[PDB]
Amino acid sequence: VTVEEVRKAQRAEGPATVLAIGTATPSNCVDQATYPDYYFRITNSEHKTELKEKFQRMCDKSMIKKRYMYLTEEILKENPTVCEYMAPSLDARQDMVVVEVPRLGKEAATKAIKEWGQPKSKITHLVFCTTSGVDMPGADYQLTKLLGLRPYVKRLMMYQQGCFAGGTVLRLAKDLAENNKGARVLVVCSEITAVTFRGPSDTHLDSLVGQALFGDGAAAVIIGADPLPEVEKPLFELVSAAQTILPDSDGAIDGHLREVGLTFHLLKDVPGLISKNIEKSLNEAFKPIGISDWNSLFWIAHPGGPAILDQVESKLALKPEKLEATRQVLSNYGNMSSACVLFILDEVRRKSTEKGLRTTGEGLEWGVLFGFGPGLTVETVVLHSVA
Amino acid sequence: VTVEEVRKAQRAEGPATVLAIGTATPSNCVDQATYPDYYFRITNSEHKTELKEKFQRMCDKSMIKKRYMYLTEEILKENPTVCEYMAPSLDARQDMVVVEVPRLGKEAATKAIKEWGQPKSKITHLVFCTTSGVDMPGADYQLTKLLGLRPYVKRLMMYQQGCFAGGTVLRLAKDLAENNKGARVLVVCSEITAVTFRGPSDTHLDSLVGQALFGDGAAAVIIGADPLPEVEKPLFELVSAAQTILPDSDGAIDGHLREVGLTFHLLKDVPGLISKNIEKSLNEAFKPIGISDWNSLFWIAHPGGPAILDQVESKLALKPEKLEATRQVLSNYGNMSSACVLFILDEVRRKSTEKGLRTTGEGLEWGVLFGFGPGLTVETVVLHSVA
């Protein structure tokens, strides 16, 4: 037998297809309205009255109503170094997220697999993504053990990538599914802010921004090409996937894993940089297939913060309806990093089904999924809806 | 315009092909024969006679002649916490490797690209792998920046996987190259032991094994499908790629990133586990091809330790010269983790040319590449040589 013959028999035929979506969050629901009172109490910072006033404004303008957090008051009372702005606490943080990340990931994966309707032994690939903690063997191994997947599942562990990774994992699963016949890829993004939670500082307001925006959550997706008729139910098709680094964006967002845990730094105008350059990525993606009206697409954008959405909306003159699904998730979950865009994808097909629309993409044919993160990196995924 | 139409024009035709191999190490060469004297001196443990005696026997049995290490005596003098067995030192270690890992990686990448002969702007994908530190943005961004790759290069950052990742990155690049027409993938593995280096402890001899085996190094590979005639020169073909977790190997190899840096643990007979199970991976991979004689293959195996090679050799009854290239790399470089098999792959084709053999695979047609690591995980890649 020749290599050319193996290649022919080994590869799939059709486009990568989203076959199921499942989501999960911690049980502790934290409402944004009174978070500043709670936050400044548990971090023993109630004497910092002016800084609390600043934080109240941050939360009021975050356009977040609630978040879900693994960290509770009880847990934080047992981990006082985590409550400090900067105290040695990495070990404490790691002990938490090394367990919680794959645990929450399992919940999302179970729901996705349940929707899927196929035996979990049919899962051939696993892409696990997180920005919360690192370990060897990784969370991918732990999840495989918790779920009881086949030991010969082909795993890819994606650590410490940040907010754009939601697009990255789809970009990955696409090539895995399309290049391997019978391949069914379980994608899981799980994020826990226990690694980034910390007390307030008067001279580090960019770190406070994180405390106002980031929430916990996990999302899982099954992806495969050549869907089995009747048995499997396509939701979306992955058409193409691009990644790029924005011009003049060096050091805009930095995150370092230190003895004090994961630190968060903002140096440049992230909303300005994204809105200034995003149309270039839209052109690159959609010019080949003859689309120039961005309002004719159904949208999924990472809600890093409300300012990104507002300025992208303004720059492109998007109708308010376009980013409704995005803003809805931001409102009800906050910024769950890499998992966000998968929650939003789930929201789009939900509202489409509920409204009884022509397609899973709000009745539209083509869509776009955006991830934004450190780099500054922009992930662009072209989507097609299903009837 | 249809999705099906896009897919047909989007994919590549032929098998993923290795077009170039480049390697690099720190300039500081460390002699293994006298390493026990040096190591126990620089870690202020000269008074630990019995332990030093044990370490001398470890080093003598390691079958390593020398290693290359970024860590010099000068650097260790300025970072005393790194010399201790367990002292807070992660920040010091991170400051080192966040820079060195992409620096050494670029050195290897430049060599590969030079052999390749094409413009670096023809690189469409970057797979970067390392077990040495984490940062946001990651080493993949830094490499893209330093090397001057196009901003829209599609990056995959693989952190904290360990020794089996040498096979993982090939499995990855295989799908990226074969599913995307014109795709050319730069794969880079870069490993720096500055994260794991620590002083000796009476009651943690498994950690001491690491100090005897692990060395620094980086390897880079250009991978693509549909090689251009004349201008590009194929070296190997990637036929298939598998991954699996061995039975009853739970917790055989653990690695934890903590405030003392990266720790290393052994709990089970790793050589025994691999040797006992490796033939299952061989059959699973080669029964389809119609091969059952493992001596008809050319071999690349991760030299985790000499014991693994010796027990695999006897278990399969391999002719002694089958693991010649593997042992040669172990002797000259030690265990460079994920980069090892790429050094060995380079050794095989150089050695074959030097012998004037009919193929790049020691004059043979089919070959196998193994990675072993935390899981206990095994990666298996079927290779085909080039005339």
Residue numbers in the entry:
A (entry chain A), B (entry chain B): 2 to 388
The publication says:
Type III PKS catalysis involves the loading of a CoA-tethered substrate onto an active-site cysteine followed by chain elongation via iterative decarboxylative Claisen condensations of malonyl-CoA. Linear poly­ketide intermediates undergo a terminal intramolecular cyclization reaction to produce the final cyclic polyketide product. The five-layered αβαβα topology of secondary-structural elements of each monomer is consistent with the ‘thiolase fold’ originally observed in thiolase and present in all known structures of type III PKSs.
BLAST searches and analysis of the apple genome showed that one of the cDNAs was >96% identical in amino-acid sequence to chalcone synthases from Malus. The crystallographic model of MdCHS2 contained 774 out of 778 residues. The active-site cavity of MdCHS2 is conserved and isomorphous with the previously characterized cavity of M. sativa CHS. The gatekeeper residues, Phe215 and Phe265 in MdCHS2, separate the CoA tunnel from the internal active-site cavity and affect substrate selectivity by acting as a steric gate during substrate binding. Residues of the MdCHS2 pocket include Ser133, Glu192, Thr194, Thr197, Gly216 and Ser338. Ser338 of MdCHS2 resides at the intersection of the coumaroyl-binding pocket and elongation/cyclization cavity and stabilizes the conformation of elongated polyketide intermediates. Nonetheless, displacement of the region B loop is not observed in any available CHS structures.
